[PDB]
Amino acid sequence: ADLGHQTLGSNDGWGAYSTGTTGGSKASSSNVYTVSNRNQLVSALGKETNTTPKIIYIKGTIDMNVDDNLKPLGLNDYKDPEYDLDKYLKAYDPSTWGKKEPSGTQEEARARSQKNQKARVMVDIPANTTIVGSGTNAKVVGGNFQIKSDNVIIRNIEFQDAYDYFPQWDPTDGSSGNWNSQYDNITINGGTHIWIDHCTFNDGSRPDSTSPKYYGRKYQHHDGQTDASNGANYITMSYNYYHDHDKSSIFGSSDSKTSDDGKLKITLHHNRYKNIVQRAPRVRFGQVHVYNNYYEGSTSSSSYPFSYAWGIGKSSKIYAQNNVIDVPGLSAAKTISVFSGGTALYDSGTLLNGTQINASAANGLSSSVGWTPSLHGSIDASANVKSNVINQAGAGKLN
Numbered sequence: 001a002d003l004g005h006q007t008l009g010s011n012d013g014w015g016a017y018s019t020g021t022t023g024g025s026k027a028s029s030s031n032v033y034t035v036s037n038r039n040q041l042v043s044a045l046g047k048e049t050n051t052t053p054k055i056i057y058i059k060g061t062i063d064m065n066v067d068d069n070l071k072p073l074g075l076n077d078y079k080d081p082e083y084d085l086d087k088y089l090k091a092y093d094p095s096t097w098g099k100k101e102p103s104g105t106q107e108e109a110r111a112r113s114q115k116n117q118k119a120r121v122m123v124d125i126p127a128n129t130t131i132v133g134s135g136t137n138a139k140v141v142g143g144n145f146q147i148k149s150d151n152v153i154i155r156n157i158e159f160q161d162a163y164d165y166f167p168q169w170d171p172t173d174g175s176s177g178n179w180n181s182q183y184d185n186i187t188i189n190g191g192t193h194i195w196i197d198h199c200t201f202n203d204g205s206r207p208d209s210t211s212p213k214y215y216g217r218k219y220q221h222h223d224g225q226t227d228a229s230n231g232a233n234y235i236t237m238s239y240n241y242y243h244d245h246d247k248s249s250i251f252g253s254s255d256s257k258t259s260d261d262g263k264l265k266i267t268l269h270h271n272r273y274k275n276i277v278q279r280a281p282r283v284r285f286g287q288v289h290v291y292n293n294y295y296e297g298s299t300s301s302s303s304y305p306f307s308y309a310w311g312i313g314k315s316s317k318i319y320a321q322n323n324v325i326d327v328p329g330l331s332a333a334k335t336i337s338v339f340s341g342g343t344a345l346y347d348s349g350t351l352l353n354g355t356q357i358n359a360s361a362a363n364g365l366s367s368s369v370g371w372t373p374s375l376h377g378s379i380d381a382s383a384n385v386k387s388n389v390i391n392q393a394g395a396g397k398l399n
């Protein structure tokens with residue numbers, strides 16, 4: 001079977017549960033498309049009711065910030081006539097506005113501006129769909145694929161720079177507030193039976209180091225790479241290359257979303273994380289199997305310094321096996337970050353800078369996450385992870 005007709009193996013992670021992930025492998029010849037621009041992609045996907053098995057091949061670079069004539073769109077094209085960053089900054093300055101959500105004219109103008117961009121860059125993927133990169137250079141630039149459906153396969157594509165021109169100021173976010181942006185490369189919002197494999201995710205030609213600071217906080221134009229929220233379940237993410245980005249993957253969006261308990265069953269294996277700051281992943285509630293992943297970075301990088309790998313959030317149940325972390329000078333405890341409600345973590349075979357460590361025990365956590373993985377392929381010895389992952393992870397390694 002060619003790349004477009006391949007399906008997820010019957011034991012390959014949580015994605016293989018029940019009906020498994022076959023994407024659009026059963027598509028008839030008339031539902032097999034090759035797309036090379038935004039117009040073709042949107043037409044091939046159709047609406048949310050287009051559940052007919054379909055295979056979409058991406059050829060070349062697809063820029064999502066383009067109009068209907070495929071001409072580039074910049075900040076001014078999306079900007080509401082009444083929006084002005086200078087006026088917005090003056091209006092919501094914490095010294096005069098205080099710590100409360102922005103409201104009024106400038107925030108309304110900012111929100112309208114953001115909705116203009118959202119209409120072009122966010123695309124919903126319908127059920128029973130396989131989207132694969134043709135050849136070695138398939139790319140999606142600026143777009144945010146949203147998956148709310150069942151049975152979707154995304155492979156061999158490089159996703160770059162899901163950039164938000166109008167970040168929202170949120171003074172109540174954290175201790176000193178933060179600027180929040182809306183687009184990920186891939187957003188799994190209630191989606192089920194998904195396989196993301198051999199993809200590459202990065203911030204393209206607009207790294208966060210080029211962003212200014214307003215109110216003492218970075219003016220962040222990016223959000224996540226592969227995030228999962230609102231009951232997403234039965235997902236396998238394998239052989240992906242995540243690099244040069246801040247917040248990579250958040251599974252479970254809120255401590256109050258107790259409906260996520262029993263869901264967010266995600267398997268992450270053979271992924272490469274290079275120069276990723278945090279959230280790799282940051283989990284709430286889910287039974288997440290993390291194995292054979294390779295993490296590399298530096299705490300003194302000038303662009304994307306390592307902060308932590310695994311985020312232990314409320315009721316998270318990370319089961320980690322044979323993962324390798326290469327961050328010179330890092331202490332064993334700082335491989336992870338423990339958040340509100342995070343009490344347990346099971347990790348075995350963890351290597352930090354070639355040394356066997358126990359991340360859970362270094363943070364005084366419980367090792368009882370209460371479950372044991374049932375769906376997984378062969379687990380590589382920790383000593384072989386770095387080579388296997390560097391050589392095989394990312395887009396352009398298959399075709």
Ligand SMILES: [Ca+2]
Nearest residue numbers: 184223224227
């Ligand atoms: Ca997100």
